[PDB]
Amino acid sequence: GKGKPRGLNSARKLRVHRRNNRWAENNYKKRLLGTAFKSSPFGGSSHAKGIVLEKLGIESKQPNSAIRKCVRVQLIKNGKKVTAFVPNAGCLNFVDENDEVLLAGFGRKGKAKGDIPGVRFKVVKVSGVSLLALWKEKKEKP
Amino acid sequence: PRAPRTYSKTYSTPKRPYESSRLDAELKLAGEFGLKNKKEIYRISFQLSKIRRAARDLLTRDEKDPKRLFEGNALIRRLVRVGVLSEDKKKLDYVLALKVEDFLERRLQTQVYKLGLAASVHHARVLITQRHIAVGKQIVNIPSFMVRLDSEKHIDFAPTSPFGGARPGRVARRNAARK
């Protein structure tokens, strides 16, 4: 006689005692307050527009040393101030201050990647022309 | 607005992606049967996986119930017409013991090969894309065709075609216009 009511008329007490439970399970937490719209940068999104400030330097977390390349942004929305991260080379160079940049996630949700600490985004485009190209030289910049 | 026109993909990919398991039985397929891309091994795979349940579905009606027989005897005769399964096997039952590999022989791609009119499997194909082969007096330009058993004997070469008629064929309006 495990812990649940079982007979026939035990609809009522079931549609409640899952709907309570669900709570805790983290996911169903995000989706009811859902956080996504109020908290976090993109709100209910995937991508966005921003414009750079400084070119900050963030060393490592440690089993590592690794002085990586990050940029503060200004979005073109809530305004948060965010940092974000660059790929490939130096990549830095090609992000010349107060330029237009196109930001996206980091495929991890929330969370925070690899050897970087409070950091949660990547730089996809600039000006809107790739980075991918303004490192495999299929275009160049204005 | 208008009747929004209706369409299902045929493909159903795999559940695990990579495997030196199943992989090195596609490349034993392609290959041996012509084909091209993996977007063939998986078309079929779907359409067998399609039929397969309409059996499962039945079997679980009783036997004898109207629906079960009708499809079976309508289901079956659809596969007798395409050569797929024999005469002698059709109880129902049994269509289940049909692996990928039976269907492939009844693709025009290869039925040409066997009707040799083709060096290897290849010379079996350009041979289809290039308007060359023909069923009635009618061209077909697509490897995946599926051989309807009672045609088969009517498989050509057409009037149009260069290998049975209307003219020599381009490269010949050249060896006769430089001596």
Binding site: - | R131, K137, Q138, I139, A158, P159, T160, A166
Partner: protein, 134 residues
Amino acid sequence: SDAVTIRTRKVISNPLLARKQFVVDVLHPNRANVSKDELREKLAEVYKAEKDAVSVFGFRTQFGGGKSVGFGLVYNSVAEAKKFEPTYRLVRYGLAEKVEKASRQQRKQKKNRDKKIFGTGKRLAKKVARRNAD
């Protein structure tokens, strides 16, 4: 060519418009499919209506060509066609010259240029010269 041959299909004895309706077919070896003007003659030849009183739209031309199909229409007497005929058609055969209204853009803008004028407004022409010369 090795000759056309016009084997025809679905003959209906339309009685409401003198017509005579059917679905045309065509075995052509080396033609590269087949010209209308020419085609009619082929039906008229047989069906006794001197071309003109005839139709034959949406040939379409098997996939190699080889074979064609459409649509069969024999009028009785050209008189009746002149009536139940869709003009767009006779301009295929040169039986009706072609009206050379404007583009539509004008034909619309020209409803919204006499709708404001209550009448002719031919007392706006002499309300011209009681507004100029004063």
